[PDB]
Amino acid sequence: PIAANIDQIVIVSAILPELSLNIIDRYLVACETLQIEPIIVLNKIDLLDDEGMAFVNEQMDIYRNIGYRVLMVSSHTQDGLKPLEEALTGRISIFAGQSGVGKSSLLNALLGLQKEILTNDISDNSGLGQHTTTAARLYHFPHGGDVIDSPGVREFGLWHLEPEQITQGFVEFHDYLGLCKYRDCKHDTDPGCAIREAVEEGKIAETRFENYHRILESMAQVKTRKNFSD
Amino acid sequence: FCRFTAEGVQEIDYKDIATLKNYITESGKIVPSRITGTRAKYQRQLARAIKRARYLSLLPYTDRH
Amino acid sequence: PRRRVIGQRKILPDPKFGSELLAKFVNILMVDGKKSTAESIVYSALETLAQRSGKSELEAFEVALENVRPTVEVKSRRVGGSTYQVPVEVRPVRRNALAMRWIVEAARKRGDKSMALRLANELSDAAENKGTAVKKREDVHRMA
Amino acid sequence: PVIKVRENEPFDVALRRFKRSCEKAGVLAEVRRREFYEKPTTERKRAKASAVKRHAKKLARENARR
Amino acid sequence: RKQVSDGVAHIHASFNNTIVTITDRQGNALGWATAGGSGFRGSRKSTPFAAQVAAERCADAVKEYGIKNLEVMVKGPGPGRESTIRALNAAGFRITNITDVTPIPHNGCRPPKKRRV
RNA sequence: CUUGAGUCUCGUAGAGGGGGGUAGAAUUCCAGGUGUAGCGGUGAAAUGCGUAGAGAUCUGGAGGAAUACCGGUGGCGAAGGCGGCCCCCUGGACGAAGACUGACGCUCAGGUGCGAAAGCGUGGGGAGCAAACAGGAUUAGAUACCCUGGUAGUCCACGCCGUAAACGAUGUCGACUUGGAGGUUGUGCCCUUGAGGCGUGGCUUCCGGAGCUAACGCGUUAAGUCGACCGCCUGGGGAGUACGGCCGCAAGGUUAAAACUCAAAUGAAUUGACGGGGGCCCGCACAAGCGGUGGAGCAUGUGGUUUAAUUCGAUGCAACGCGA
Ligand SMILES: Nc1nc2c(ncn2[C@@H]2O[C@H](COP(=O)(O)OP(=O)(O)NP(=O)(O)O)[C@@H](O)[C@H]2O)c(=O)[nH]1
Ligand SMILES: [Mg+2]
Ligand SMILES: [Mg+2]
Ligand SMILES: [Mg+2]
Ligand SMILES: [Mg+2]
Ligand SMILES: [Mg+2]
Ligand SMILES: [Mg+2]
Ligand SMILES: [Mg+2]
Ligand SMILES: [Mg+2]
Ligand SMILES: [Mg+2]
Numbered sequence: 001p002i003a004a005n006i007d008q009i010v011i012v013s014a015i016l017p018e019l020s021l022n023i024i025d026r027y028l029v030a031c032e033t034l035q036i037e038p039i040i041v042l043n044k045i046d047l048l049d050d051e052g053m054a055f056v057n058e059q060m061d062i063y064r065n066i067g068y069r070v071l072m073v074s075s076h077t078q079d080g081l082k083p084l085e086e087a088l089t090g091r092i093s094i095f096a097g098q099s100g101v102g103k104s105s106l107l108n109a110l111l112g113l114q115k116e117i118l119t120n121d122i123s124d125n126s127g128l129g130q131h132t133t134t135a136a137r138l139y140h141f142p143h144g145g146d147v148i149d150s151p152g153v154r155e156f157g158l159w160h161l162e163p164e165q166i167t168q169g170f171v172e173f174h175d176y177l178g179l180c181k182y183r184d185c186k187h188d189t190d191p192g193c194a195i196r197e198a199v200e201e202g203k204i205a206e207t208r209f210e211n212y213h214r215i216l217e218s219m220a221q222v223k224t225r226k227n228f229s230d
Numbered sequence: 231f232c233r234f235t236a237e238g239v240q241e242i243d244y245k246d247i248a249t250l251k252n253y254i255t256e257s258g259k260i261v262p263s264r265i266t267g268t269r270a271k272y273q274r275q276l277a278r279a280i281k282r283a284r285y286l287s288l289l290p291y292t293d294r295h
Numbered sequence: 296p297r298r299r300v301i302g303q304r305k306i307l308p309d310p311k312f313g314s315e316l317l318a319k320f321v322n323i324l325m326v327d328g329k330k331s332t333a334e335s336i337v338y339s340a341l342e343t344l345a346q347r348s349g350k351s352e353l354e355a356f357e358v359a360l361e362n363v364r365p366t367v368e369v370k371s372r373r374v375g376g377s378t379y380q381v382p383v384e385v386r387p388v389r390r391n392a393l394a395m396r397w398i399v400e401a402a403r404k405r406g407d408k409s410m411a412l413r414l415a416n417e418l419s420d421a422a423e424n425k426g427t428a429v430k431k432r433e434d435v436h437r438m439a
Numbered sequence: 440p441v442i443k444v445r446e447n448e449p450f451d452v453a454l455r456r457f458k459r460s461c462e463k464a465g466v467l468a469e470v471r472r473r474e475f476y477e478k479p480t481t482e483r484k485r486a487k488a489s490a491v492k493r494h495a496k497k498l499a500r501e502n503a504r505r
Numbered sequence: 506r507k508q509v510s511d512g513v514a515h516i517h518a519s520f521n522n523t524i525v526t527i528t529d530r531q532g533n534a535l536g537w538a539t540a541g542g543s544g545f546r547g548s549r550k551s552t553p554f555a556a557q558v559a560a561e562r563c564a565d566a567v568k569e570y571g572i573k574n575l576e577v578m579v580k581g582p583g584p585g586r587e588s589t590i591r592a593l594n595a596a597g598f599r600i601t602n603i604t605d606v607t608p609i610p611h612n613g614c615r616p617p618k619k620r621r622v
Numbered sequence: 623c624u625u626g627a628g629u630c631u632c633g634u635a636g637a638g639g640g641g642g643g644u645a646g647a648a649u650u651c652c653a654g655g656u657g658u659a660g661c662g663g664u665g666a667a668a669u670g671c672g673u674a675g676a677g678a679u680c681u682g683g684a685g686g687a688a689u690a691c692c693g694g695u696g697g698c699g700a701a702g703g704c705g706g707c708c709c710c711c712u713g714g715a716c717g718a719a720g721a722c723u724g725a726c727g728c729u730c731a732g733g734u735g736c737g738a739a740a741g742c743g744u745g746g747g748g749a750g751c752a753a754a755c756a757g758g759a760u761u762a763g764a765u766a767c768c769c770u771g772g773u774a775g776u777c778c779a780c781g782c783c784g785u786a787a788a789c790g791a792u793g794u795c796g797a798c799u800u801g802g803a804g805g806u807u808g809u810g811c812c813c814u815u816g817a818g819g820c821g822u823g824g825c826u827u828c829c830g831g832a833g834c835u836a837a838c839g840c841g842u843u844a845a846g847u848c849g850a851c852c853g854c855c856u857g858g859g860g861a862g863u864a865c866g867g868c869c870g871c872a873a874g875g876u877u878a879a880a881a882c883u884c885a886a887a888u889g890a891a892u893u894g895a896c897g898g899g900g901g902c903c904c905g906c907a908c909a910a911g912c913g914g915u916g917g918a919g920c921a922u923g924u925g926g927u928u929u930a931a932u933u934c935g936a937u938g939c940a941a942c943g944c945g946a
């Protein structure tokens with residue numbers, strides 16, 4: 001465990017360090033298995049040009065089209081935080097995501113902590129950023145509630161989760177359970193897989209389907225260990 | 231085998247092209263001593279002669295050239 | 296057989312032509328041990344085949360299976376560590392069985408209301424290298 | 440390498456003698472041992488190991504009976 | 506178009522592709538085929554049967570030249586060396602002379618590094 | 623004085639060293655000839671190159687680097703190292719016989735020199751290869767492995783650096799101590815000699831006796847038996863680090879602590895266990911076959927859900943028509 005007695009997680013992603021429709025999906029599956037309410041934030045929109053913003057929003061809407069709260073905030077310019085502040089009030093929110101995405105900087109901006117005390121902030125070099133914050137610290141929200149700064153992560157793999165729990169984790173799949181002619185429908189190429197055609201007509205996000213399949217096949221690679229996770 | 235010593239030869243001559251050509255393959259490669267049965271010092275003399283002949287184009291370096 | 300490559304047992308000749316191949320044919324065609332049904336079917340089919348082919352019905356069966364017997368077939372091998380197809384020749388005793396097997400399945404697919412007729416029609420087309428029994432033989436030769 | 444056909448010679452025997460000639464020169468092993476550079480240290484160690492293995496095999500040849 | 510009536514079949518048996526060309530004994534090319542241009546790609550491209558196909562794929566487009574006999578010079582370690590000429594004879598070509606011309610250096614140049622596969 | 627050491631005469635073998643020519647393959651490039659549509663690369667791909675004509679093939683040219691086969695468990699060198707052929711200069715070793723000198727010897731702190739690769743300075747050269755870097759794939763990422771390119775460097779001249787698992791992890795010199803099989807290079811005698819047999823030296827490889835060793839192993843080329851001299855060690859980290867000195871253009875090298883901390887750290891061998899290490903040998907394990915299950919209806923068991931209660935137990939194989 002990283003943090004307990006949590007009420008809400010906020011998946012913090014940023015375009016510069018890495019854009020990963022795969023890590024976001026792994027986090028969504030996890031929090032769905034943990035019943036914790038998630039929320040997606042995308043940091044450093046200041047780096048993207050206006051065309052690039054219109055190029056990132058039409059796939060950030062993938063999740064807001066299945067209800068997920070999706071916000072875009074620039075920590076350096078403090079742009080568009082204000083709805084994030086509102087969504088953060090009066091709850092317990094763990095700031096999670098890859099290293100370098102801006103989780104510490106976002107906290108500095110939101111908390112408005114005294115200048116003498118600030119979270120460590122090093123800039124990313126080449127492909128990926130450093131791991132500055134190596135701890136998990138609680139912070140009292142100014143208005144109400146608490147946030148938690150967490151250390152950056154590389155792989156949020158899910159071999160502990162059962163394969164069915166991944167189908168449940170994708171919320172856009174309940175609309176098609178029991179609609180597959182083969183009852184034990186792996187849904188990849190099995191005939192009559194409802195979600196197959198569903199994504200054929202664009203009802204489902206293709207990227208989400210491919211991510212589901214690839215994380216399933218990833219579980220096969222990491223099932224090599226005989227250690228137990230129960 | 232060991233014909234050189236058997237004839238007590240003192241020095242193998244590069245100019246001869248009929249004798250030492252029994253010691254190269256059709257591709258012109260120096261046949262190893264394991265199968266010719268020649269002895270070490272004579273094998274070395276043979277290699278030097280053969281390289282000399284190659285230099286003066288009495289023996290081809292390779293079947294292609 | 297990992298340790299002992301056991302030899303195959305002998306089949307008894309058929310009580311109507313003393314032909315080992317005919318008995319093997321009825322053994323292949325048999326279903327649920329109902330030998331009598333199979334022998335009825337095979338004798339009916341052979342006799343109608345005789346009517347179309349005139350004399351020597353047992354011989355007509357021989358040349359029918361001959362026109363579709365396989366010579367070369369693909370075989371799998373894992374020596375490479377990956378699935379590997381290889382074209383290999385077939386022993387006569389085995390290609391006999393392969394021809395008989397292909398004939399009977401093709402007949403079952405033919406339908407048209409009677410097994411007697413299906414078998415006879417397939418045999419009649421086989422006798423002249425046709426009926427798709429030869430086509431299945433031709434495709435596995437092409438796969439060499 | 441070079442194999443010249445004669446008059447009234449079957450093509451198959453010509454092919455087989457050509458291939459057995461080219462493999463008598465070991466040309467394939469030559470072009471395969473010159474595909475990647477091999478540091479002289481690894482060359483020396485593998486040569487020495489092959490040699491000592493040869494010596495051990497020729498020793499086993501004559502230590503069993505005696 | 507013009508019958509030389511005598512010529513040479515040059516093969517190129519790489520571990521990736523097989524290139525079979527036809528030319529006069531003087532080295533001016535007439536027709537050339539390749540397992541790649543034969544509709545075989547990837548692992549399918551570097552197969553002995555692919556080279557066997559490319560054999561006819563080359564022989565056809567030089568029927569107008571109609572060389573009767575020919576000499577083959579094969580160079581390359583790739584599979585299919587023997588199968589090209591086996592197929593070429595099955596096309597009615599008569600092989601006057603087979604010869605290997607695999608380029609071999611006398612320790613002339615540094616080859617690339619060993620792949621740490 | 624001549625037995626140690628050294629000189630001379632006559633020969634032998636040798637990738638010993640330095641300098642200069644030259645050769646033949648091969649890579650790349652350029653120009654041209656033929657000619658078509660792909661080439662290239664991988665596990666599979668992509669990047670990349672190709673219609674201005676690639677790739678392929680032929681001819682001519684240019685340049686650099688290295689010397690298939692011989693080739694070896696081979697040779698030479700103090701060590702590092704040394705591999706086409708030829709010439710010039712030059713070092714060492716060994717053998718036979720004889721003469722010569724007459725202890726002139728061994729080791730060596732300081733000192734001097736040589737010293738792989740990488741690296742540094744200046745100036746050339748640059749074909750191939752290739753840190754860095756650019757790109758394409760894989761991947762969470764690939765900052766790596768793989769792919770396409772590619773700079774320094776790799777080469778030459780002159781300086782500098784002075785370190786390597788610079789290893790036989792075995793200092794140099796001398797004497798003595800059972801054997802066997804080899805390799806290489808001298809040399810004597812006898813043979814009818816090619817052969818062949820008796821000997822006698824040098825170097826070198828593999829077994830193995832006594833003996834030694836913790837064991838592994840060493841074993842006349844000792845890690846045996848002994849002499850002479852030198853270097854080095856005193857638990858593991860801290861640390862070959864700090865400081866100072868010396869050296870270096872610099873990178874850094876050499877000499878070289880202490881505070882502090884632990885009760886271990888380590889070498890060999892034993893038994894087992896494990897290996898994305900091998901050799902197997904079996905098994906309807908697979909293959910070869912025949913019929914099924916998986917879809918339908920129902921029977922039955924179980925999970926779940928439900929219920930006042932749906933009694934309890936059995937739960938990977940080896941629970942689920944199981945207790946019953
Ligand atoms: N351009 C830009 N940089 C930003 C922005 N927000 C934060 N950054 C910078 O991006 C870096 C993020 O580092 P940090 O916040 O520690 O990352 P993290 O996502 O919290 N994880 P970790 O601690 O593991 O690195 C810092 O240099 C920060 O100043 C932004 O909106 N724009
Ligand atoms: Mg942070
Ligand atoms: Mg493991
Ligand atoms: Mg390559
Ligand atoms: Mg005197
Ligand atoms: Mg000293
Ligand atoms: Mg250097
Ligand atoms: Mg330099
Ligand atoms: Mg320079
Ligand atoms: Mg590279």
Ligand SMILES: [Mg+2]
């Ligand atoms: Mg990438």
Ligand SMILES: [Mg+2]
């Ligand atoms: Mg010089």
Ligand SMILES: [Mg+2]
């Ligand atoms: Mg040292």
Ligand SMILES: [Mg+2]
């Ligand atoms: Mg040492």
Ligand SMILES: [Mg+2]
């Ligand atoms: Mg000692």
Ligand SMILES: [Mg+2]
């Ligand atoms: Mg000394």
Ligand SMILES: [Mg+2]
Binds near residue numbers: 841
């Ligand atoms: Mg021993």
Ligand SMILES: [Mg+2]
């Ligand atoms: Mg100490």
Ligand SMILES: [Mg+2]
């Ligand atoms: Mg130091």
Ligand SMILES: [Mg+2]
């Ligand atoms: Mg089976």
Ligand SMILES: [Mg+2]
């Ligand atoms: Mg069913």
Ligand SMILES: [Mg+2]
């Ligand atoms: Mg129960």
Ligand SMILES: [Mg+2]
């Ligand atoms: Mg109980």
Ligand SMILES: [Mg+2]
Binds near residue numbers: 943
């Ligand atoms: Mg039962």
Ligand SMILES: [Zn+2]
Binds near residue numbers: 180186187188194
């Ligand atoms: Zn489905």
